Design a protein around this ligand. Sequence first.
Ligand code: SAH
Ligand code: SAH
Ligand code: ZN
Ligand code: ZN
Lengths: 386, 386
Amino acid sequence: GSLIVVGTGIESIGQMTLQALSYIEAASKVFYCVIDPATEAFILTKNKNCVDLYQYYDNGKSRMDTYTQMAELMLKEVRNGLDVVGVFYGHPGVFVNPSHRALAIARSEGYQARMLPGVSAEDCLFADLCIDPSNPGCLTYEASDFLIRERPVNVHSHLILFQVGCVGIADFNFSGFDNSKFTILVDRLEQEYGPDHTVVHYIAAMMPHQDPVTDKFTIGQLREPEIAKRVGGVSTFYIPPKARKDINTDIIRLLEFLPAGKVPDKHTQIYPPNQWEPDVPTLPPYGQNEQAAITRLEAHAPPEEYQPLATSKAMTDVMTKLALDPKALAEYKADHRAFAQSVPDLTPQERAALELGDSWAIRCAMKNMPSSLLEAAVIGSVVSSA
Amino acid sequence: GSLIVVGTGIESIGQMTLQALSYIEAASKVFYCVIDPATEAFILTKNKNCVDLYQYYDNGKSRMDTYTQMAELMLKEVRNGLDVVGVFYGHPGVFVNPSHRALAIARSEGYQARMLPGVSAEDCLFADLCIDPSNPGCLTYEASDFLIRERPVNVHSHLILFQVGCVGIADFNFSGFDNSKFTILVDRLEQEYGPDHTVVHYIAAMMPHQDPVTDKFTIGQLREPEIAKRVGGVSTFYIPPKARKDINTDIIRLLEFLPAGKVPDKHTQIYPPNQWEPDVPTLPPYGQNEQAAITRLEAHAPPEEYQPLATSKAMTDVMTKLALDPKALAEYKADHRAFAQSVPDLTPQERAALELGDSWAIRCAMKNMPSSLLEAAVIGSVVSSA
Ligand SMILES: Nc1ncnc2c1ncn2[C@@H]1O[C@H](CSCC[C@H](N)C(=O)O)[C@@H](O)[C@H]1O
Ligand SMILES: Nc1ncnc2c1ncn2[C@@H]1O[C@H](CSCC[C@H](N)C(=O)O)[C@@H](O)[C@H]1O
Ligand SMILES: [Zn+2]
Ligand SMILES: [Zn+2]
């Protein structure tokens, strides 16, 4: 037996990866927890043997018990010698208890266990809010865990909080959560950021035609019942930096990031600014260096050492096959020589490269195939803090 | 004109989302920065008009200049009235300057600008290391920015560092980076975590048959030239928690997470443990509560209020179409009535639901279609700290 756990992303159907889909298709048995009905419907057309894990939540039932069951249902089948696929919406290991639970148990018992990544709600937040986690660093917490364990804030970096809709709730209810302890989360955020600092209420669109909720509030507004009512089981908070941290220009020098003895402006960031953030000194989009780079584009030719793609249909076909056909990949991994020998239309260099399996060899083969004469010459909580 | 920016994920071809692929296909013009040759080859079969952005890096050329150019090339075409698709490997907004740069400029100039999320190397790290960012919180930094701005560590939460392969390098070289300031990063990590704490050197597999590098070291080992040589342009560091933070059992009480006047054990975590972490008191996989939940599965029936999927082929088809056909989605968004009227085989409830467009209506329609008589009765650095 074996367990593969895959994701579906957040927005229905379209945010599923190609490999997630091919593993769902190849499974003996599929267990899924998805919250968009069209994704569910899609999944059912792809495998004849699926079980909805959502039926294992209940009113007044500890989510922890639900997660134990979701994990055991998959493990039963793995122990029976089946190739099971677990499917969880988003990324299946981001704020999901039973995926990790089932995988760690499977691994302990000596079964093949693999998780494939997906697009998380945080990934969606980056995209819909056009923020880059690198500028100026990103800290992500579960909201109750943030409270429970008094986890430190970082006011100079992005803050993302999941499960703001179920603060201190160990439970479930089909009617939704009664987020009565929400006020405690606001207290903490006010203590850390002040009632006037920005909080974005974020809900990624689940249907392709839907708009994201990207509502800019102040933390103090979260105390108003009309505002607070809208934060539910699919709500995430984004808290922008309160201030930026100075560049340490002496560390700049030590790293020799810039020419010797030079200094950047300590207070200024790179274009673009973060829309959701209070004003920060930011470089203009088209200063001297940018104009120089743009005027230089006219003179541009590809550098000597740049090597363009130079492959064939047959090579492109086999690589595509290895990515999209789990069976063919398992065959290739079991025996590189036999598999490579069977591939149609491969050049002897392509063949040998595939035979070797080395990343260097394959990359070289795909850049060295001559093409011209010249060249040849909504309640989906799947984790709990408790 | 318009700009859509999409990702390809990390592992070749298979980690591309369905929507990324459909937007690449529909584009007038495609600009791409991908580092796996098979993904490049795949992309070229999907659109007839592509430009490789990789040719805009050069030896001794400031990456910032490269990013200015990558962004301007896309913006030129947007200004010409084209529907441009920018493609960046991974998630196109995670540690990527020019995507954000081009989008913010496009938006300022009044063009339609959208980023679609993808699978990041961090998403891959979660999956390959089976860690959950929620336990016990996740902090992500760019490595040079971590140094430059003396960003605080959090020894009780996960730490992820990108671009460990190019510390204090503003530059590029086709032969790879000369990571001479790497030692400065080690100094900081030793200062914060001690020479004996774990660091995982992580490289997600780029080819479907490749294994990830998931090498467990101590921070002190990073000083050895034989170890340090292997950290390159696609290297990420994972630093597990040094210790766990106590539950504050008085905050537990305030949130009424558990029955009144009850207490959990302050020092104990939920199963499973984190493989990469030093020993932590962890609950066993099958204690009393888990066995209770499992024996209870035998008695299990779906709760009264659980509503199984109950839709039709025609509805599933149209929802699938809206997810996978950008043109059909644009048509639907332009006019809900006319589009819904045109859809084959829709039930009048399905029709009206599609006409309304409301998430509630569509979800209700997909759970209320009766099916029985009873029921009817390698150098890819795309960001810089500078
Ligand atoms: N459409 C959506 N928009 C914003 N956040 C969402 C969301 N769906 C789920 N979430 C976040 O995820 C939490 C449930 S945990 C499930 C997360 C999912 N595995 C993922 O990859 O993101 C919610 O409480 C919320 O914080
Ligand atoms: N195969 C791989 N494995 C691990 N980390 C990787 C990787 N490819 C890229 N990275 C990380 O990404 C950095 C370049 S920034 C590009 C990141 C990409 N947009 C993404 O979504 O992840 C590298 O320095 C490294 O830290
Ligand atoms: Zn200044
Ligand atoms: Zn104890």
